[PDB]
C-alpha cells in the first residue's frame, strides 16, 4: 500500500475505509495479521473467497492488523492529519502510508469507450 488518504465522516467510517484498503493491498503483514479461528472453506469444504474472508475477519476485529502494520513519521501536512492504531488522530505519527483528510474529498461519470475485436476497452 504505497499511500492511502481517507475522508470518512466518523471514526467508524474511517476505520472501515482503512481496513478495506489494508485488505485490498494484499500486504504480507495484512495476511500475517490474521489471528484466531478463520476458516477459508465452508462446512461443505467449498473454497471461500480469501479476500472476503479476510475482510470479514478484520472487520470483526482489527486491533492486531493495525498493531502489526507499522507507523510512519508524519510532518504537519496541512489538512492531512495522521491516524494512529488506537483510532485517535495524531500529527507526528500515523499508520504507514495512511493519512486522514478533512477536506471531505468526494467518479460516477460514464465515459464513452471504444472496444476492439478482442474485447479490449480503450478510452
Amino acid at each position: 500500500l504505497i499511500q492511502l488518504i481517507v475522508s470518512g465522516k466518523d471514526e467508524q467510517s474511517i476505520a472501515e475505509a482503512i481496513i478495506v484498503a489494508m485488505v485490498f493491498s494484499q500486504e504480507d503483514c495484512m495476511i500475517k495479521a490474521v489471528r484466531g479461528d478463520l476458516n477459508f472453506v465452508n462446512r461443505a469444504n467449498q473454497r471461500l473467497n480469501p479476500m472476503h474472508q479476510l475482510l470479514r475477519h478484520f472487520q470483526k476485529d482489527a486491533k492486531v492488523l493495525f498493531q502489526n502494520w507499522g507507523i510512519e513519521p508524519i510532518d504537519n501536512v496541512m489538512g492531512m492529519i495522521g491516524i494512529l492504531p488506537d483510532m485517535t488522530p495524531s500529527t507526528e505519527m500515523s499508520l504507514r502510508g495512511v493519512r486522514v483528510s478533512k477536506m471531505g474529498v468526494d467518479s460516477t461519470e460514464r465515459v464513452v469507450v471504444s472496444i476492439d475485436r478482442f474485447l479490449r476497452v480503450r478510452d
Binding site: L65, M87, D106
Partner: peptide
Amino acid sequence: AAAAAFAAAGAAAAAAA
C-alpha cells in the same frame, strides 16, 4: 450522493474502544 453499490462482510471493527 456517496453510496455503496454492494457491501459484503459484517463491517465495523472492534479496534475502536
